[PDB]
Design a protein around this ligand. Structure first.
Ligand SMILES: Cc1cc2nc3c(=O)[nH]c(=O)nc-3n(C[C@H](O)[C@H](O)[C@H](O)COP(=O)(O)OP(=O)(O)OC[C@H]3O[C@@H](n4cnc5c(N)ncnc54)[C@H](O)[C@@H]3O)c2cc1C
Ligand SMILES: Cc1cc2nc3c(=O)[nH]c(=O)nc-3n(C[C@H](O)[C@H](O)[C@H](O)COP(=O)(O)OP(=O)(O)OC[C@H]3O[C@@H](n4cnc5c(N)ncnc54)[C@H](O)[C@@H]3O)c2cc1C
Ligand SMILES: c1ccc(CN2CCC(n3cccc3)CC2)cc1
Ligand SMILES: [Br-]
Ligand SMILES: [Mg+2]
Ligand SMILES: [Mg+2]
Lengths: 483, 486
């Protein structure tokens, strides 16, 4: 069958591109994915990674995890109940999450049913030729042909996949994919990785762990969450520790064996050992290009295995494009979506547009959470002669009463001190992901620190800290910190 | 007894002006207030209304009230506990609020002592003359002089005070001032009025009420929260109703009598009756001008009662200025603070600056809460030929799992459709007050709807809805509402 566009991967970027090309530009569109609903064996499905085994289910589970703090914190505000009656029922959480994800799967199914000129094909997409996508029964390229799709234009949108280190006993470890389907909450769990997925899952497991349970997070480097603001990295480490999570930095698994009861015996490179019920590898995500048989058309990959693209998401092969995680740049749903829309506008609208990968607001649903947009100070300090840091850090009042005195809210604004242009805003504490969104709009408008401090506060809020900072806390001048 | 600046009222506006003048411009400042710490008899104290009987304690108590919803909502996420064991200990909440407020009172005392040329004077400020403030022992102008203060510049920052309607039995009623100190949570309470204070307290009382408890809010007109977005006014009404609060609109107390058991018998203008344990009046606040003896220097008041000011906070009398609620405009702490910082940056900094009273971000800590900035559409529609309204309204997914299906999140952007300039942003739902702050910055920068929709979303948030709206839901054209443009 013949299409203006064939999209391989019915994910965040793929669905934006396919729906826009079909509905805004009246193109005949095919979209391919390996599953119509969430979970084993392929985990991602119609809707993509974010819907099925990412942002959507993890956010619901972090919300679930937050109640452990709310229940404890309620006492300071005079709430009384039988503490010994408190149980975290993980089965209910997983069932609630499964229903939520399945409902989305179903609506996307209804979307393809009800959208003329937008067709879904179940199976494994690969490139036969530069204008033919083959859909097969399995990821094995010798598996049965279900469809052959003639395509003026081909979009690769297959996303990414957990990285598993080749160590002895890797087979006894899981990724985030399996973590979403654990039938019982682990009593002891090691999250391996200092990234958002490890930190977010440490918080989820810490809340739902059965009595006498323990969550350990391990990371090779000295400080979790590289890429984030350093003050926030130190504070979130402290605040995770304060809520009972063991942060093992400068530590990495060397091998895993099974103890006689089926629990996992972890040997760290340092020789240290840990007995846990689950080992969750969250050490990285790699672009999913193996299964695409890109050798058939000579699309240029990087040694990492990402599809190389120009700013307009164009591969080295005309009429073949790549968006989203497969391009190994910013692995965010809204970036994927933005690239998909920009690509379709460019190619089918002749409305040339490229995604801006700078000043993207993002979040970490840690407990407590992070919101951030733009440059951290160390980065700004290499690119600008004079950099100012405006910093407010303090346990908010509600958390003196709550008993969570460790919950320091951090707000930091990084500026080009030569003109006061805001380069970065970095938040830690309840609300941070919600606060940072409109900050993304501020940085698009080249907001200066004067634009923040001349804006009238909403009081009382954590956000008003951003509009209450008149004076630098310190500077970088030619890369040197000057207190 | 000689100062560059004398400030009457150690509140939100008064202390910002005082501290700035002293620390930024090495000026000599006197600040007068009636009380050094919170509560009876004068309620407001060092730190002002907001710190003592306003934003700060109210926010702590709304946070306390939110745990009723979190404890119920936790069950959808798998939290299990003995629901019959749950009790709301009001006395604990009030004791914790009292300690939090006292620490702020003490924090301000430290500020005055640890700051050269910044001195606190206890007692009642009034104007003797153009350049002299008298501190007396009481509000009676006949009481003893404690001090006579020489002032190169006088700042009036005495704030506002609850209005109590002059109805038979008003003496059985409380204001917000007494609400903060109730020894026991009322079983039945009538919050009177449709403004933020009535709404916030109806939420607080609703969460802490003992078993068989009932919170009634009455409002004299048809729809609470006049001046807020109409969609949000209707929605908050529904969501308060859904959480057990009874909303009596077009109803107003004509009198209150004590029943023999100490409870209050409310007779409405309509003839309806209601027995409650507390009647909290929250029908308005009025500027505190009486006690300053303004007649003594001829400071002009408004047809309403507020000190008349120009854009630089100047009265008709030179060297005499007025900021905050005494001006009877926007009664918000950060507005008072902004006016104070501008007055001082003007007069002592030689850097004239005027508070912008448009595009002010503000909140209602209703459950769930409002965050708003700029014009509601009815107001935009009279000022602008073509107004677009962008609206998103849905129960977020977590609240389909929580079981609070009624918690619809509302996001509205109001624009000038001729250039896309955002004129206002109106939010109802968890985190709205936190979301709206950086929207205030966007409005200062003349953000267009395209600046929002071209900004990449943070996912998943409620906030990202603001970056997801490309197509108007409807328009006003020369005041007329319509789905489509001609
Ligand atoms: C645990 C986790 C949490 C995350 N949390 C967030 C968050 O909170 N916010 C955020 O913005 N981002 C988050 N992300 C990142 C976000 O999920 C991704 O950036 C986004 O899904 C990438 O979208 P995409 O279009 O590149 O691909 P995806 O949405 O992953 O879609 C790719 C699709 O292609 C399919 N597929 C793969 N190979 C083939 C093939 N050969 N043939 C057919 N179909 C194929 C897959 O089944 C999948 O559905 C998270 C990721 C994970 C793993
Ligand atoms: C229940 C309630 C909730 C509120 N919630 C919020 C909120 O969430 N957000 C917000 O922004 N605003 C809120 N406000 C409003 C806010 O409190 C005021 O806008 C703000 O306090 C006004 O500041 P001001 O500087 O005008 O005066 P105030 O802060 O009221 O300070 C006035 C001071 O003057 C003193 N005083 C009065 N007369 C004399 C005299 N003759 N001599 C000496 N001292 C005198 C008083 O003791 C008082 O301390 C709330 C108000 C109340 C009542
Ligand atoms: C979860 C959430 C809310 C409830 C209702 N109870 C709240 C507290 C009341 N209470 C006050 C003082 C003594 C009891 C009674 C109603 C139950 C379970
Ligand atoms: Br490091
Ligand atoms: Mg179709
Ligand atoms: Mg002093």
């Amino acid at each position: 069958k013949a299409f203006d566009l064939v999209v391989i991967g019915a994910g965040s970027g793929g669905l934006e591109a396919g729906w826009n090309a079909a509905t805004l530009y009246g193109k005949r569109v095919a979209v391919v994915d390996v599953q119509t609903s969430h979970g084993p064996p392929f985990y991602a499905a119609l809707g993509g990674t974010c819907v099925n085994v990412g942002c959507v289910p993890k956010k619901l589970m972090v919300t679930g995890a937050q109640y452990m703090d709310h229940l404890r914190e309620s006492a300071g505000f005079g709430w009384e109940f039988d503490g010994s009656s408190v149980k975290a029922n993980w089965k209910k959480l997983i069932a609630a999450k499964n229903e939520a994800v399945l409902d989305i799967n179903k609506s996307y199914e209804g979307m393809f049913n009800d959208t003329e000129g937008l067709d879904f094909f179940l199976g494994w997409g690969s490139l036969e030729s530069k204008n033919v996508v083959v859909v097969r029964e399995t990821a094995d390229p010798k598996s049965a042909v279900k469809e052959r799709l003639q395509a003026d234009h081909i979009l690769l949108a297959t996303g990414s996949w957990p990285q598993m280190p080749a160590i002895p006993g890797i087979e006894h470890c899981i990724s985030s994919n399996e973590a979403f389907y654990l039938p019982e909450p682990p009593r002891r769990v090691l999250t391996v990785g200092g990234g958002f997925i490890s930190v977010e899952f440490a918080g989820i497991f810490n809340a739902y762990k059965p009595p006498g349970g323990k969550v350990t997070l391990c990371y090779r480097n000295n400080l979790i969450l590289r890429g984030f603001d350093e003050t926030i990295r130190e504070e979130v480490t402290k605040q995770l520790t304060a809520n009972g999570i063991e942060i093992m930095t400068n530590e990495n698994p060397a091998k895993v064996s099974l103890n006689t009861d089926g629990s996992k015996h972890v040997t760290f490179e340092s020789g240290k050992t840990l007995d846990v019920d689950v080992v969750m590898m969250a050490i990285g995500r790699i672009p999913r290009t193996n299964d695409l048989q890109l050798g058939n058309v000579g699309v240029k990959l990087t040694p990492k295995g990402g599809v190389q693209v120009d700013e307009f998401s164009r591969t080295n092969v005309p009429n073949i494009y790549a968006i989203g995680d497969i391009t190994d740049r910013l692995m965010l749903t809204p970036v994927a979506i933005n690239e998909g829309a920009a690509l379709v506008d460019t190619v089918f609208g002749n409305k040339p547009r490229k995604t801006d990968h700078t000043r993207v607001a993002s979040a970490v649903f840690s407990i407590p959470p992070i919101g951030t947009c733009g440059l951290i100070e160390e980065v700004a300090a290499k690119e600008f002669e004079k950099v100012a840091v405006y910093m407010s850090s303090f346990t908010p009042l509600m958390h003196n009463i709550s008993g969570s005195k460790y919950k320091k809210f951090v707000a930091k604004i990084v500026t080009n001190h030569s003109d006061g242009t805001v380069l970065g805003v970095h938040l830690l504490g309840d609300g941070a992901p919600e606060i940072i969104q409109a900050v993304g709009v501020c940085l698009r408008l080249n907001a200066k620190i004067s634009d923040f401090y001349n804006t009238i506060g909403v009081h009382p809020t954590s956000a008003e800290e951003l509009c209450s900072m008149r004076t630098p806390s310190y500077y970088y001048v030619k890369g040197e910190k000057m207190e």
